[PDB]
């Protein structure tokens, strides 16, 4: 079973990055099983759509009263030591958000960590018959 644990926004970085404070400390987040185009490598610039889904995921968790954190089955931290996980605002999940809006493709699964993998297919299968953002 995975469990949500309270987190406070310390800043929204990215579509697909936030920083929180968590159990008494600064750390960064990337959201699991989600790509948003960005808006920073030096390489392509900024992909369409990356102003988007940044608009998108600092909105969502900059007014939420509650922001939660849900650490998967697998690795908890990638190769750069940001913590891998599903984030809640308002009890609303910003990975699935962002995909059910176009704003974001659901990404290979990552070392075990595929629990809402499914969920989230789906959420994508739908915004792409919608023709939304991403899938126009």
């Given at each position: 079973?995975l ?45 369409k ?10 909105k ?10 849900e ?22 999940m910003?990975?699935?958000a ?7 493709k659901?990404a ?15 959420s ?13």
């Amino acid at each position: 079973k995975l469990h949500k644990e309270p987190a406070t926004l310390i800043k929204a970085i990215d579509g697909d990055t936030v920083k929180l404070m968590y159990k008494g400390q600064p750390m960064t987040f990337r959201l699991l099983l989600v790509d948003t185009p960005e808006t920073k490598h030096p390489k392509k610039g900024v992909e369409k759509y990356g102003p988007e889904a940044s608009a998108f995921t600092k909105k969502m968790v900059e007014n939420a009263k509650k922001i939660e954190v849900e650490f998967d089955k697998g690795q908890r931290t990638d190769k750069y030591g940001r913590g891998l996980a599903y984030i809640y605002a308002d009890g609303k999940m910003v990975n699935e958000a962002l995909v059910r809006q176009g704003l974001a493709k659901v990404a290979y699964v990552y070392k075990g960590n595929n629990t809402h993998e499914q969920h989230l297919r789906k959420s994508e299968a739908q915004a792409k018959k919608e023709k939304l953002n991403i899938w126009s």
